[PDB]
């Protein structure tokens, strides 16, 4: 457990070595360097977890150095480890190692092999810093590292400009979320005087006795940062746009690292949100709205990567729904299970893409369930895990825990949103599977982990997070059978609509309200159009207006006036003697008159 900082150091060492290699090294040695760096990080994580379970499950602090200290402002470089941080670190390192060896097999014959592995190593290091930070500012360092690695990794193929534009869009919206988070940080310092999590939690009720408004602002501002990073409402418009990049980086963003950071913020800063329950209910409302809108958007999508991006969007909405109903353990369990099956889904999708060599839309694909057996099996079990199939998957148990936390706390409307979202998720994943397919070691590991074997593993969240109120056995029975019935009804509806000849599908898709809804939901409820017409277009217009530098001309105006006055005065030097004598006479008259009036 004393090697906690090695999980930061080793991916950093791999990133530095692969960045300064500059592609002179072979693919084999670069593969060993990157895969071994992430594997050593994962092994150190496993040893840390073993020693954590062998020491009585107590929190640990490793202060490396102090970052800054001006008077009362003391910020240090301290790492912390509890059950939540251990769970986050373990899932990040394990899924990153599987994705890294899949990329080592996958990215062969590509320019930028060492550069790609350097960027993913720095992404892993930033995520480890994010999950192992004692204070808010080191957490913010990991936050910015995650954002910069997202920019460097989404636009990996810099030759085509849409990848670069999508990377810039993703970095812009995530930096806006960073600014919201920075507002949270400034408010929390100005009110509490510290940025340590435990110290902020113990000192919050003492200072906010007479007024709980600035803490409400701080929790709302943390919510803004979380929805900035996790692609939630209203900063959600980067996922599907930036999902034109490569496959293993796509699985690394969606599964373990990036979209789980806001969930980690809501779970870690749970006490501050507990003294402001209105903001926590706002978290639940935003998560429910985003998951329903993600289901609506993925209903009509025609690409596999876009469908999976909106599916991850819905899963992060589910996690925020769990967090809003004070079900933290359910949220982290859903985080781990979703990491596993979404990594499996994206690796299978990349296998399909490299099997067909091109990003063809789903309607140009068919009869592939017999061409590739193994990829079909992996994609089937991943889709079943995402659809929450009862008694065989782990996402079913995770969503059941989420809905039990919603029921026992009294959130009926959020539960209704949850069952509707489960219906939507099952329907769209198997509509994509039935359109595509009708008409190895990481894959095996994730296939095992996406089943109930992943539900056997429980995060050690007892003692760090408050206990969610357990549902009664009868009520839990009705909730479980209702979730299963809605899920299998979704499976049967997708089977009825898309397996055979799609007659009821094209009849309503070709109608003018149906085509209007399809166009509305294909562009994600018109949010990209709104963000161009409200924020991007006036920015471009102001830039075009100001490119002349108007203030420079405004301060050059005295130079123009001086030049004009000088050329006007130079007309008096005509060179005539009689005009000179008349000018002396005029000046004599003026001087004498001015002396007479004074």
């Amino acid at each position: 457990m004393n090697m906690l900082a090695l999980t930061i150091i080793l991916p950093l060492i791999g990133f530095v070595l692969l960045a300064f290699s500059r592609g002179r090294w072979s693919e084999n040695v670069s593969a060993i360097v990157g895969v071994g760096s992430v594997g050593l990080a994962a092994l150190v994580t496993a040893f840390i977890g073993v020693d954590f379970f062998a020491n009585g499950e107590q929190t640990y602090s490793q202060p490396l150095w102090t970052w800054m200290s001006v008077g009362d402002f003391n910020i240090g470089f301290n790492l912390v480890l509890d059950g939540l941080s251990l769970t986050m670190l373990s899932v990040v390192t394990g899924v990153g190692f599987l994705i890294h060896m899949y990329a080592s097999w996958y990215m062969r014959g590509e320019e930028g092999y060492s550069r790609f592995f350097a960027y993913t190593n720095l992404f892993i290091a930033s995520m480890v810093v994010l999950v192992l930070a004692d204070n808010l500012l080191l957490m913010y360092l990991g936050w910015e590292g995650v954002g910069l690695c997202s920019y460097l990794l989404i636009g990996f193929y810099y030759t085509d400009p849409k990848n670069g534009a999508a990377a810039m869009k993703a970095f812009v919206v995530t930096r806006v979320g960073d600014v919201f988070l920075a507002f949270a940080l400034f408010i929390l310092y100005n009110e509490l005087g510290t940025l340590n999590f435990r110290e902020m939690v113990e000192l919050a009720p003492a200072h906010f006795a007479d007024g709980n408004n600035m803490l409400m602002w701080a929790t709302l501002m943390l919510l803004g940062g979380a929805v900035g990073k996790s692609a939630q409402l209203p900063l959600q418009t980067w996922l599907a746009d930036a999902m034109a990049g490569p496959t293993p980086v796509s699985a690394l963003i969606h599964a373990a690292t990036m979209v789980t950071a806001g969930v980690y913020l809501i779970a870690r800063t749970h006490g501050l949100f507990l003294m402001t329950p209105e903001v926590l209910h706002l978290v639940g409302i935003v998560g429910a709205v985003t998951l329903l809108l993600a289901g609506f958007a993925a209903l009509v999508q025609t690409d596999i990567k876009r469908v999976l991006a909106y599916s991850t969007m819905s899963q992060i909405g589910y996690m925020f729904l769990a967090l809003g109903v004070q079900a933290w353990d359910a949220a982290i369990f859903h985080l781990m299970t979703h990491a596993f099956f979404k990594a499996l889904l994206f690796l299978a999708s990349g296998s399909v893409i490299l099997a067909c060599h091109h990003e063809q839309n789903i309607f140009k694909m068919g009869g592939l369930r017999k061409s590739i057996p193994l990829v079909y099996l992996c994609f089937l079990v991943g889709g079943a895990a995402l659809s929450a199939l009862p008694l065989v998957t782990a996402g079913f148990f995770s969503k059941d825990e989420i809905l039990a936390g919603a029921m026992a706390n009294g959130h009926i409307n959020l539960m209704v949103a949850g069952l509707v979202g489960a219906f939507m998720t099952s329907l769209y994943t198997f509509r994509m599977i039935f359109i595509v397919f009708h008409g190895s070691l990481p894959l095996i590991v994730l296939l095992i982990l996406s089943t109930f074997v992943g539900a056997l593993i429980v995060p050690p969240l007892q003692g760090v997070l408050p206990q969610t109120t357990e549902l009664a056995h009868g009520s839990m029975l009705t909730l479980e059978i209702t979730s299963g019935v809605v899920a299998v009804v979704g499976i049967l509806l997708a089977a009825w609509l898309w397996l055979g000849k799609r007659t009821l599908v094209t009849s309503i898709a070709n109608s003018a309200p149906g085509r209007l809804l399809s166009t509305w939901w294909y562009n994600a409820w018109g949010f990209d159009w709104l963000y161009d017409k409200v924020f991007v277009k006036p920015f471009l217009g102001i830039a075009w207006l100001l490119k002349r530098d108007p203030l420079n001309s405004m301060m050059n105006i005295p130079a123009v006036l001086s030049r004009f006055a000088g050329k006007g005065l130079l007309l008096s030097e005509n060179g005539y003697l009689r005009w000179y004598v008349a000018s002396m006479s005029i000046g004599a008259v003026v001087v004498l008159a001015l002396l007479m009036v004074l």
């Binding site: 800054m68 001006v70 030759t159 400009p161 670069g164 810039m168 600014v179 400034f186 301060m555």
Partner: protein, 504 residues
């Protein structure tokens, strides 16, 4: 006692650089390198000798090392130098940038390199004298003497691809702005001295003697306004900022000239050293205007930097935005904001120096500065695109680089005093990321939009790579371990802030 030698060693070094041009064309660059080596070594010796980490704050004035000599006894004017933690940090940064400048002009085998070097060391001595001197005539004299050689290099040695008339216009604009504002500063200094003489009866231009004066409200405001006008055009602060990108785009293409003369950190040093302690009530009244001017400068500089097709002009507007952030930090009256301003100033100097060196090397590769004729240079060039991406990552305020640290301590102190300007400035940081990403998309990523970017280009040599990697290492060390820089300047910042806020 070592401060006069700190000022003069670049001057005598430049004198031997000019006189040794007869010995050979490759001779004066070596002599300039050695005299910057002695300057930087003496600055580091003062850093290790003064004992700055464990220094208590004794109030204004508390000088670590002082020197006094009469210059004009008729007016009571002294060559009076005084170094503290902040001035030491600025002198160390100045010597570092001078070493980087003399390294970045190493490939010049021209006929008149001796006068170019002589003007460079005179610029370095002038800015060092600005940082060290506290007497107002001597500070003003260094302030104005550091203009003539810089103007001469812009006019004579400048951008060869442009006509001489454009270089003449840019140099004349810069010199007119700086010298006229210096004249306004001289009026303010003279009026303050005359009021002190009327109140007491002693002829003195010394800094410590002029602090305790009966300052009527209305006169102190005018003196502060003149000082702020000078330090605002030399910061730069909008709309007094038009000279900066004109001087950058028409600078000599070596890139040493931008590190030497334009990249001064002297205006905010004068704001902390002269505008705030001499006029506490005037600055307390004036603070909303200056902070709103900083907001306007940040957003305006971001809007220019997004819309420029010239990369050097873009980095000039980055300098405008960062100095607007520092201007916001100065008039807040917070220790945290002042330390953040110091960290942001040092980090901006290092990051802008790296960006200017890389832009000069890139222009040497492609023979063009227009960003619309270049694209996809990541697969054509060896080391420069990655280091340029690192420095543009630094210039948007990224952790692991000192710009994030400086900006965030600035914003923490500001939000401790004023919330709305803090939130608007942080949205300005969003705009900073926007223009940094726009420059990286328009310069290095995409397809080759011409033929000069469609061919494989020669890589950097060992010297440019070594100085850029040294700048990278110093930026990383400043971003991750900013503590020794903080305790170096903890005393002077404490004295300035205490004089600012315990007097009101």
């Amino acid at each position: 006692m070592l401060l006069p030698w700190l000022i003069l060693i670049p001057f005598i070094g430049g004198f031997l650089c000019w006189q040794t041009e007869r010995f050979g064309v490759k001779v004066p660059r070596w002599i300039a390198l050695i005299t910057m080596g002695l300057t930087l070594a003496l600055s580091l010796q003062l850093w290790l000798q003064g004992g700055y980490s464990l220094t208590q704050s004794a109030g204004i004035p508390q000088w670590q090392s002082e020197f006094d000599m009469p210059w004009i006894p008729r007016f009571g004017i002294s060559i009076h130098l005084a170094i503290d933690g902040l001035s030491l940090l600025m002198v160390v940064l100045t010597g570092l940038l001078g070493v980087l400048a003399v390294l970045c002009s190493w490939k010049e085998i021209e006929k008149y390199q001796g006068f170019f070097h002589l003007n460079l060391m005179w610029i370095l001595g002038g800015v060092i004298g600005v940082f060290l001197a506290i007497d107002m005539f001597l500070f003003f004299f260094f302030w104005e003497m550091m203009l003539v050689p810089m103007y001469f290099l812009i006019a004579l040695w400048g951008h060869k691809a442009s006509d001489g008339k454009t270089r003449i216009t840019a140099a004349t604009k810069f010199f007119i702005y700086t010298q006229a504002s210096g004249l306004v500063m001289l009026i303010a200094i003279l009026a303050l001295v005359f009021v002190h003489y009327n109140a007491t009866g002693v002829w003195t231009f010394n800094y410590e003697e002029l602090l305790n004066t009966p300052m009527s409200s209305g006169v102190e405001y005018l003196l502060m306004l003149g000082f702020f006008i000078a330090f605002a055009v030399k910061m730069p602060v909008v709309p007094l900022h038009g000279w900066l990108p004109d001087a950058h785009s028409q600078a000599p293409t070596a890139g040493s000239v931008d590190l030497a003369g334009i990249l001064l950190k002297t205006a905010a040093y004068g704001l902390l050293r002269f505008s705030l302690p001499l006029f506490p009530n005037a600055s307390a009244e004036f603070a909303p205007i200056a902070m709103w001017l900083g907001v306007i400068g940040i957003f305006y500089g971001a809007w220019m930097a997004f819309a420029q097709t010239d990369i050097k002009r873009l980095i000039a507007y980055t300098s405008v935005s960062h100095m607007g952030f520092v201007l916001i930090a100065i008039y807040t009256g917070s220790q945290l904001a002042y330390q953040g301003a110091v960290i942001q100033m040092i980090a901006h100097g290092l990051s802008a120096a790296g960006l200017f060196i890389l832009c000069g090397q890139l222009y040497e590769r492609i023979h063009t500065r227009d960003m619309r004729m270049m694209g996809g240079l990541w697969s054509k060039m060896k080391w420069l695109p990655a280091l340029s991406l690192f420095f543009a990552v630094a210039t948007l305020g990224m952790p692991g680089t000192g710009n994030f640290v400086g900006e965030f301590m600035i914003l923490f102190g500001s939000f401790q005093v004023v919330p709305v300007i803090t939130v608007i400035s942080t949205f300005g940081l969003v705009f900073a990321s926007v223009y940094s990403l726009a420059m990286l998309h328009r310069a290095y990523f995409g397809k080759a939009k011409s033929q000069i970017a469609s061919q494989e280009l020669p890589g950097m040599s060992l010297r440019e790579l070594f100085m850029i990697l040294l700048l990278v290492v110093l930026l990383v060390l400043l971003g991750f371990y900013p503590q020794p820089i903080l305790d170096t300047s903890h005393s002077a910042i404490g004295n300035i802030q205490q004089w600012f806020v315990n007097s009101v």
